[PDB]
Design a protein around this ligand. Structure first.
Ligand SMILES: Nc1ncnc2c1ncn2[C@@H]1O[C@H](COP(=O)(O)OP(=O)(O)OP(=O)(O)O)[C@@H](O)[C@H]1O
Ligand SMILES: O=CCCCC[C@@H]1SC[C@@H]2NC(=O)N[C@@H]21
Ligand SMILES: [Cl-]
Ligand SMILES: [Mn+2]
Ligand SMILES: [Mn+2]
Lengths: 246, 627, 181, 86
């Protein structure tokens, strides 16, 4: 029942989706912006479409309205969001169902549930999973801050209240430089993400980052496809990954 | 159809038919305007002419010129424009004898044509006989009636009703007789086709006045502005009650085109009746057409002034200068006044006939012919037995364009025909019906397979041209999607062109560089075509093949003969793939006014020859290979 | 006033070709009562309605009109005398002149005009936007070289619009040389 | 034979009936007659090529070719004398 597919994305992943799509005899639609005008991925689908010349630089793979209207113009059954743009965006997927188009991903409730790093942690606690201490929720002021700081432990890390890019975090080791941390990494979590809601948890020393792959269908069956070791990081940012872990 | 017409009669406003997609560029730009340029403003045009009567966007020369010169399917032009402009009537001009073609046809060709043209979008057929012969107009009319569309019954205008000394025949009473008669044939609308712009302002007023009195049908006036009096004419037509007039946008108007709709708009301020259109959007339409028109500069008409000598000689449309061009080809350029005069005289020699394609070519041909052979009205008859009249005129006197209002001079006919029988009946009645099945059979065998009805009559109508359109389509695919500048010029080094195939399907093409020609006159083009490097090979036609670059002889290879010095090929002597002995002459060069005959080292089969007579050569150039 | 000043002839000079046919009728009509001067009328066929303006003025009793020979007529020139001669057939008043001689002159000027092709304007079409902006004879195209000659020739839309506005800004003036400069 | 199309034809006398001049620029494809041959009105004299279009130049009347100005593949401007006939 999927006949047209649009990818709300660029580059390798876009192309990758286009490959699977063709392999399933599904027609493909690409979107592109002004300077992507040369990007390979745009030439590798069956139809391609400029996404608002009105739009600007990078803020144009992000324009929900202008992109759904493009989908509507080509009768698209389904949108693949790839990763890293609207892929984690609540509303985008809502406007998709609201307009007869099948968002290619989790259920609306799921994006909301993990759409935020507190909720994620709360949802986890209820699923009865081990989790990092830290705080019951977000933290404004700095009075809020010093409290938990002189209470449990001292290696601690204040961090962004969402988003999968490790740019807005910062680690507190010792008494005082706590000052900066809160702010330095509050409104540098600003420029990175939407806002700068930030909390603090334990900072676990010398950890390995292991992630598990899951897939499920629309009929209650779910498998995992094992781990990846993503511990080789520069920022808090993945540089080399291995599957499965060693 | 009946109801539309009734509707028109009610309208206080003057309605208009836009001729920009057809008549305007047929007159001004040799009918060269491409689908591409029409399509791009179709959505604007739909808005502008929302209350227009119709758009004339088909017929006349467009069928044959689209398929032939522009290499594009006139059927696509109609179907695309039809989808884009779903709200105004589409009108075409249909000559009664042969619809849109170049010949005579059995009646089933007329029927099949109108049948398919109705189907694909055409709502109004302006039917006209080139001799105002009603009888020839009955086949087309029926076909339009059975198709459910609107049949527009046309009278062509000649002479001058203001002037009783002009004709005893082309009178107010003739035109009234013809209109009343067209009405009984049950046409929905009376059209007056003033193909030569002969309808002087008062004439129009008197003429439309009478017809409105005479017939209950709505009247559609069509004129060209070639005397410079077009707007005046329409103005008077309007005081007399005319229902519809044919106009063009300012920038595609004037001279031998339709009168300007933008002008007509303002000309009428302060008068009883009002043109029904958006000027705001016609100024806009005008600007677009003004720029696009520049794409077509190579086909601009010669004409640049009003010409009132029209009222003596009556050469319709462009003819008063094609014929001048034509007269120059025969040494008569200094004597064009004598041709303009012979044009008129030949008209009376022929009974005084209506002159449009194809009758006007007849009269033109005779005139050229008579001045060329120092001939007059008497000697044409006296020496006629030993004269070779133009094929067009023998065709005319044979009955093959139809019956002229006044009949044939029996003696003149005798002399032109030299025995040959004339038709006693309209030409189409003589012809066997076309077996359309046999035609499908053939086209499907020639092509892929799947062939349509539009393929079928297109072929019947235009066998050669159709065939050729098809070879072109096989070679280059759909030319009609190129933008006009690219279509006419190609691309310059460094350009990126953006061809639209379909909603979200384009080709981005960049031309990078072109190589010098290889030994065969082939240049290598380097493109990029969306995202990928691409190389194409094209044959150059030099003017002089001294430009061509020859590969270098492999020196450590006994098969390659090299150029031992500069010079010229004075004579090629052996050809590719051919036997020669040791010490055979196979190429004579010239060094510095010195012969030397490059000869074969061993017994050989000549593998290659990279040279023609009078090619440049430089030291170390591969001239020949031998096995 | 001009009659009072002792001018022998009253001329209406329509430099921008803005005298619409009906206007021409009513303006020459009234003037013919108002004063005893004969009326000499001058127009430019830039809108494409010059002949019509002439015919209406003639109905209204105009005395003299400025015309040009066919091949040197039309668009921003005067209307064609050759055209008017016939245009008037059947109407009350006839143009006093020799068509046959005029056809002859047209032909002469036709070839001669060829010597001057480096000098023709781009103007090749009537233009009825003159009624919004009011630029007299030349200007419209002149004032286009100049606007590209300073990199504004991509929004001559706005120049045209500013031209009109400047006009009212200056309290709405007559526009010929040199007021149109 | 260093220039071949860089010879200069004279200009046809426009007021001489026996002078045939070029009507536009282009190319001689094929000379079809010699100085001396007799011809009939309308005979092929010359095939030229303009911008990828072939025009055939014809005898204006019957007569005698007196000079032929061009060779296959020469180029010509409007006004160049191509042929004299009597
Ligand atoms: N509480 C913590 N203690 C120590 N290191 C941490 C902590 N939280 C995050 N990090 C570091 O940041 C990395 C990823 O941070 P986080 O889980 O917030 O991912 P993200 O920034 O949302 O993006 P992603 O997890 O997809 O890489 C971890 O691999 C780890 O190196
Ligand atoms: O001839 C050289 C270039 C090839 C151009 C072909 C185009 S296709 C449309 C037009 N009609 C023709 O027969 N040829 C040109
Ligand atoms: Cl009038
Ligand atoms: Mn016509
Ligand atoms: Mn003036």
């Amino acid at each position: 029942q999927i006949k047209k597919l649009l990818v709300a994305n660029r580059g390798e992943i876009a192309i990758r989706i286009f490959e699977a799509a063709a392999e399933l005899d599904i027609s493909t639609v690409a979107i592109y912006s002004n300077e992507d005008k040369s990007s390979l991925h745009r030439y590798k689908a069956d139809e391609s479409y400029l996404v608002g010349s009105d739009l600007g630089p990078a803020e144009s793979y992000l324009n929900i309205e202008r992109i759904i209207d493009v989908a509507k113009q080509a009768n698209v059954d389904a949108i693949h969001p790839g990763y890293g743009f609207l892929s984690e965006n609540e509303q985008f997927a809502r406007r998709c169902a609201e307009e007869g188009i099948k968002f290619i991903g989790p259920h609306l409730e799921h994006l909301d549930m993990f759409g935020d790093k507190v909720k994620a942690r709360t949802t986890a606690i209820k699923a009865d999973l081990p989790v990092i201490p830290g705080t019951d929720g977000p933290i404004k002021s700095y009075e809020l801050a010093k409290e938990f700081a002189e209470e449990a432990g001292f290696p601690l890390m204040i961090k962004a209240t969402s988003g999968g890019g490790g740019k807005g975090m910062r680690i507190v080791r010792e008494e005082s430089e706590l000052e900066d941390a809160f702010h330095r990494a509050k409104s540098e979590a600003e420029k990175s993400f939407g806002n700068s809601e930030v909390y603090i948890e334990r900072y676990i020393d010398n950890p390995k980052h292991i992630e598990v792959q899951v897939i499920g269908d629309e009929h209650g069956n779910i498998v995992h496809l094992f781990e990846r070791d993503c511990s080789v990081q520069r920022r808090h940012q993945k540089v080399v990954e291995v599957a499965p872990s060693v | 159809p009946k109801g539309v017409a009734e509707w028109v009669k009610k309208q206080d406003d003057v309605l208009l038919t836009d001729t920009t997609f057809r008549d305007a560029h047929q007159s001004l730009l040799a009918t060269r305007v491409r689908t591409k340029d029409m399509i791009n403003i179709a959505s604007k045009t739909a808005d502008v002419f929302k209350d227009g009567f119709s758009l004339e966007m088909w017929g006349g020369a467009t069928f044959d010129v689209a398929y032939n010169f522009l290499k594009e399917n006139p059927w696509e032009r109609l179907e695309r424009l039809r989808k884009a402009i779903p709200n105004v009537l589409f009108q075409m001009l249909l000559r009664a004898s042969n619809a849109v073609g170049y010949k005579n046809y059995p009646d089933n060709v007329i029927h099949k044509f109108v049948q398919e043209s109705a189907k694909a979008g055409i709502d109004v057929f302006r039917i006209f006989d080139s001799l105002n012969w009603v009888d020839q107009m009955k086949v087309a009319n029926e076909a339009v009636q059975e198709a459910g569309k609107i049949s527009e019954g046309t009278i062509c205008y000649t002479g001058d009703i203001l002037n009783p000394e002009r004709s005893n025949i082309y009178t107010l009473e003739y035109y009234v007789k013809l209109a009343k008669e067209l009405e009984r044939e049950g046409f929905h609308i009376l059209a007056i086709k003033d193909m030569a712009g002969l309808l002087k302002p008062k004439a129009a007023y008197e003429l439309i006045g009478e017809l409105k009195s005479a017939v209950d049908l709505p009247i559609h006036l069509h004129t060209h502005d070639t005397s410079g009096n077009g707007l005046l004419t329409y103005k008077q037509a309007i005081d007399a009650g005319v229902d519809i007039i044919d106009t063009a946008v300012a920038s595609m108007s004037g001279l031998t085109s339709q009168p300007s709709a933008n002008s007509l708009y303002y000309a009428l301020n302060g008068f009883p009746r009002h043109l029904r259109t958006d000027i705001e959007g016609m100024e806009s339409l005008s600007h677009y057409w003004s720029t696009v028109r520049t794409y077509y500069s190579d086909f601009e008409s010669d004409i640049k002034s009003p010409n009132t000598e029209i009222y003596q000689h009556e050469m319709p449309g462009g003819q008063y200068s094609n014929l001048s061009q034509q007269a120059k080809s025969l040494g008569l350029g200094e004597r064009f006044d004598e041709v303009k005069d012979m044009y008129r005289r030949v008209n009376f020699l022929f009974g005084d006939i209506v002159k449009v394609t194809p009758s006007s070519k007849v009269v033109g041909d005779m005139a050229l012919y008579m001045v060329q052979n120092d001939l007059d009205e008497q000697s044409v008859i006296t020496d006629g037995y030993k004269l070779d009249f133009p094929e067009s005129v023998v065709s005319f006197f044979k009955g093959e364009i139809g019956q002229p209002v006044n009949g044939f001079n029996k003696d003149l006919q005798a002399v032109i025909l030299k025995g040959q029988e004339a038709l006693t009946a309209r030409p189409g009645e003589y012809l066997e019906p076309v077996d359309f099945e046999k035609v499908r059979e053939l086209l499907e065998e020639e092509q892929q397979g799947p062939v349509t009805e539009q393929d079928i009559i297109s072929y019947v109508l235009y066998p050669k041209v159709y065939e050729q359109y098809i070879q072109t389509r096989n070679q280059y695919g759909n030319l009609s999607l190129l933008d006009t500048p690219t279509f006419f010029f190609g691309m310059r080094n460094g350009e990126t062109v953006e061809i639209e195939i379909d909603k979200g399907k384009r080709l981005i093409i960049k031309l990078e560089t072109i190589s010098e020609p290889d030994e065969n006159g082939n240049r290598t083009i380097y493109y990029a075509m969306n995202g990928q490097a691409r190389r194409i090979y094209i044959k150059d036609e030099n003017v002089h093949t001294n430009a061509n670059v020859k590969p270098k002889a492999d020196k450590s290879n006994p098969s390659h003969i090299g150029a031992q010095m500069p010079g010229s090929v004075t004579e090629v002597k052996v050809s590719v793939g051919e036997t020669v002995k040791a010490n055979q002459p196979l190429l004579i060069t010239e060094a510095m006014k010195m012969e030397t005959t490059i000869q074969a080292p061993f017994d050989g089969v000549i593998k290659q020859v990279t040279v023609n007579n009078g090619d440049t050569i430089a030291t170390g150039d591969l001239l020949i290979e031998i096995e």
